[PDB]
């Protein structure tokens, strides 16, 4: 068995997204907190997680549960103190974990000192945000028009009138989330200042949110006005409704990538000047594949985020997908990613329905196997390691500003992100062990007695035990250094093979369909029989250690196997 | 390497007969014309030809409106000319496929006249529905549903004779058969049996996505409205106004196709000789397209449905990563054992060099010839023919006439891809002795013609010949494929086969020079020999590639011959 050089930590980490409000409540207020995370850092070691990122924990009025940041240099009081954060870093680092911070560079709370100073036209802050005059209305001079038809992601105009300043400010998100002017060198310098502060504290890097919205059209390019976004011309949207416009002037502007490349320059300089393990930036943006790959860098030699997140398992695959769709979407990242790009795989987050809800309850293990066996970085969202489902959230219990703004009692479910933010299922105790109180900030999902971590640790076969076996398998040279081959055997079943001369072969077989499928293992490259089941889905006929001798393999709907075969 | 049945790796050439060769100076291509140039297919290294329809037709849709599925269109010639074409093609080793459209018949067909007059056994040959009353103006009949014709306007036409609407997914003159009528399904078997008895090597079957529409029996006796697109740019008479939920890709259409294949399998068993095939045409999403091959329940359909991805999903707007990702789509979705095919043009779409670029013609023909399976060539692609200019005044395409006007006809017209074939630099590019050609000859025929390309050292046609010859190599018939983008500008396609020479396409699909590391290309050992280069390449056939660093100019494609793996 050949010797392999270990990869840089960020090229093949298991990265786990914590939603701190919903992870662990240590003080009975029904709100997850830093002492809660600290008390369960051992969970990440137990799970085989290398790195955690937290949804925002900075001072925030909580309009968008942390994404409206009023102070980028201190901790939100409900989550705890700077001292709790420093204790979290110390204890995480002692356990060998990396810790990344999430913040949204696009915007600040209207309660931030930046915005208070800006609205007052304070020297240094007047132009910190996008401030615009009304569009001249010569035909009805007493009727004030917004600068353009731009629509907020949370509904209504992206322009809010300031009585104090007698101008509109831009908010691509909530009224309380004010868009920085990213053509302002002082805004760009402030972003370096924020990152330097948290790197100096010992953060191992950043997840940076909402990057497609950084830059909007310069009125200088449109005869001194903000240009209207083109109309979608879809009958089902009026001017206050997201979908009314195509964001040609408000999203994916080529200038945003220059800001990202400057962030990478800054981080490269920081790493050179501090040594120890590489500090990284992982970018978030929902965009088409071309716009997504520009986050890595460009073919003029620019270098950007260590990677942009791959949301293809959220946006392009679901329970509607067959095995050919799975393979074809997996191939999209691998086909479009630049030479030397690190692939990553995301199955969920706090903005989207949970993995088993988007797919099916019988597919959890197969989805975690894909995550863990594809080359590069596995990304796990809080709860995927135990197969948590969307929780039921009534209109009455809904707190997501997106649903409160865009929805009503009949439609709120089309918008609300709350079902994927329900408290983590630790055990079958009061509130699934998330809290000692029956009062939790979102309702605990009704299935917690059936789906909880403690039950999965006790029972012979579980989502969590499969998760542990897969994160353990990623330490094998075959998964860190091995080649990959992926093809559909049928509309129902695909294989993913990891192989490496002189090292064991590992094969995923996954029936993603609602029907049984019999496949010819003779078609699977590098699969020599007999082979051993390393991992099986929790209801597979095959237990771990089951010998596969026949070339004919019948798989149930949703059944997934990892086979261990002799080296190539 | 066991010999493949002919249709698994044939070079298939689509003839548009009206535009191929005029033998009789009426400016209309004809069968004696085709017969006179059958040697062209041998010269080019074409194995099989299919013709756009040549059956009796009022020519409203230039042959796709068929008034008699059992005889030849007089302008193209006679049954005897067809029998001669088959005779001489088979002598030259060629296969000949007939195109007919099972979906619809000419309103001048006996089927229609008899159906409209309610003649017994013909009453239900076509889709006949009652009008709806009109809230706005009671005197004005409304059609059975909001269904929109592929050529614009309602898919329902009123018959004064029958006092009912008939369905036409295409032209008013193209009447949709009822494919739930066993007598209609029998008549298709009768038409196929007739032409297979004549010696045809199989069929191209048109417009299959449109065979079957919603049964009113499943909608309380009414034809259900297609959903609205809700797109403000489309009015109720314009294609795009509806989503064809009840009018296209109904699962029942595939059962008809599986029955056709069952009939052909029986015929092939009972007659022996060379396999007679069915290749299906349908523009549909990839999963609905794959159902034409067969289904997972074990149904067997068309020998293959045509792959239109180089028409629908790639263009001059595409980068190397797009090329790779779109090529992977057929290869990812195709059933195990399926034959891949590659289509770069047809008589319904702009010519290959117009959709892409003039400097990409060689690369595109290399892709066609070097990918696994079947290369499909549309008349003109072997010489890099460009779209012809066709004024409103000279436009004869019903689609442009019905959907378009002097300022918009170019958005819809298929005529630019149907201009006469460029044989030489003689009158009408040698298509005809006459200057009275049914469509105007493209302005560039003096620059782009088969004769010129045969007598210049380097040409699209000589590259085409080099590539059809290369398909005889086991590496291309049986070899593995590896395909990846080296950059946004350049991709490789490697064919490899243990102990047989490796063949490598490098293609810069961009408008800019690109320098690639050939060390990244699998199975490529240097030195390698240029087998084929783009006509504008600095590299000639026989040139040795010795450096690992290769600069490709805009549109430049090389086929390298390299050491066996
Ligand atoms: C990215 O950004 C928006 C606004 O900050 C937030 O609502 C989402 O939760 C986040 O992923
Ligand atoms: C398929 O069918 C339509 C109608 O018959 C025709 O106009 C096209 O030319 C053909 O490819
Ligand atoms: Ca912005
Ligand atoms: Ca039909
Ligand atoms: Mg708490
Ligand atoms: Mg003629």
From TrEMBL, chain A:
Keyword Calcium: yes
One MF term in the entry's GO annotations: metal ion binding
Binding site for Ca(2+): 106, 179, 213-214, 216
UniProt catalytic activity: Hydrolysis of terminal, non-reducing (1->4)-linked alpha-D-glucose residues with release of alpha-D-glucose
Keywords: Calcium, Hydrolase, Metal-binding
Superkingdom as given in the UniProt entry: Eukaryota
Span of domain Glycosyl hydrolase family 13 catalytic: 17-421
Matching CDD domains: AmyAc_maltase
Enzyme class: hydrolase
Binding site for Mg(2+): 25, 27, 29, 31, 33
EC identifiers of the protein: 3.2.1.20
InterPro entries: GH, GH13_cat_dom, Glyco_hydro_b, O16G_dom_2
Single Gene Ontology BP annotation: carbohydrate metabolic process
Protein name in the entry: alpha-glucosidase
